[PDB]
């Protein structure tokens, strides 16, 4: 996160850290949607252009964390993956279309003050909140500036942007399975996700029932926090059917 700030304790109890066994390093952000399922971006797991093709035994899931590098004893929990599911029509070749993947934990994790799941949007919620000008929240342990790393979890609030503006800001073919967010050049304020934030959740709080909902997944961007450029997130609701499809039968 660039131009953000330190999250407060228990602010994002669903935030997940995708950690690599060897070498031990941060791999990506993710989110807890139930006691046995983790949602993240597909490119965190598969991405041929960089020879990236991880398996269930290559990673570990770290939940309930605040600090980026410390093993927060008695607070965080580590889980092993039992299976991974990449969306079958994930287009890593062109524009990272349908950048999404589900991860099945070997065993359920017990919730606590620091470990709680976020809600998945339904049509009504998505329809009512997914509007330009409405702000969302992105969290991550990624880089603080375009390339170093933050000591603690970073948070930033960003406004959703009109499709047209998003489209005219890049040469990348935009699809309906993605949306973009960030401040415009004149708006004065700034901020963005960056390397290392991948797979992180973009969430919004409902004014109707006060629950937090995850509307997106940090997918891609061109540089970090450059004027005239915006971050792109996977449109979670649009892939809601595949999500239920999987979980349901597995």
């Amino acid at each position: 996160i660039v131009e953000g700030s330190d999250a407060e304790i228990g602010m994002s109890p669903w935030q997940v850290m995708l950690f690599r066994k060897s070498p031990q390093e941060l791999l990506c952000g993710a989110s807890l949607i139930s006691d046995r399922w983790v949602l993240t971006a597909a490119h965190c797991l598969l991405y041929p252009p960089w020879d990236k093709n991880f398996t269930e035994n290559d990673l570990l899931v770290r939940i309930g964390k605040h600090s980026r590098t410390r093993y927060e004893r008695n607070i965080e929990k580590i889980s092993m993956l039992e299976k991974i599911y990449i969306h079958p029509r994930y287009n890593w070749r062109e524009n990272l279309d349908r950048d999404i993947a589900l991860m099945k934990l070997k065993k359920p994790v017990a919730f606590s003050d620091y470990i709680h799941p976020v809600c998945l949007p339904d049509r009504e919620t998505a329809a009512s909140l997914l509007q330009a000008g409405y702000k969302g929240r992105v969290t991550g342990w990624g880089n603080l500036k375009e390339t170093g790393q933050p000591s603690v979890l970073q948070v930033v609030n960003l406004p959703i942007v009109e499709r047209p503006v998003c489209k005219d800001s890049t040469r990348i073919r935009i699809t309906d399975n993605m949306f973009c967010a960030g401040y415009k050049p004149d708006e004065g304020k700034r901020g963005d996700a960056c390397e290392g934030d991948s797979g992180g959740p973009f969430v919004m709080k409902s004014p109707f029932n006060n629950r937090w909902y995850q509307m997106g997944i940090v997918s891609w961007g061109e540089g970090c926090d450059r004027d005239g450029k915006y971050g792109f997130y996977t449109h979670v609701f649009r892939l809601k059917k595949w999500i239920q499809k999987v979980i349901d039968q597995f």
Partner: peptide
């Protein structure tokens, strides 16, 4: 069931530093 409700905030009716920023942008 009780997804989206944080133990240290919503469940004890406390508000975080900036959630006010989000709600003030939802101008329907």
């Amino acid at each position: 069931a009780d997804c989206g409700l944080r133990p240290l905030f919503e469940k004890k009716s406390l508000e975080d530093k900036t959630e006010r920023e989000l709600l003030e942008s939802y101008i329907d």
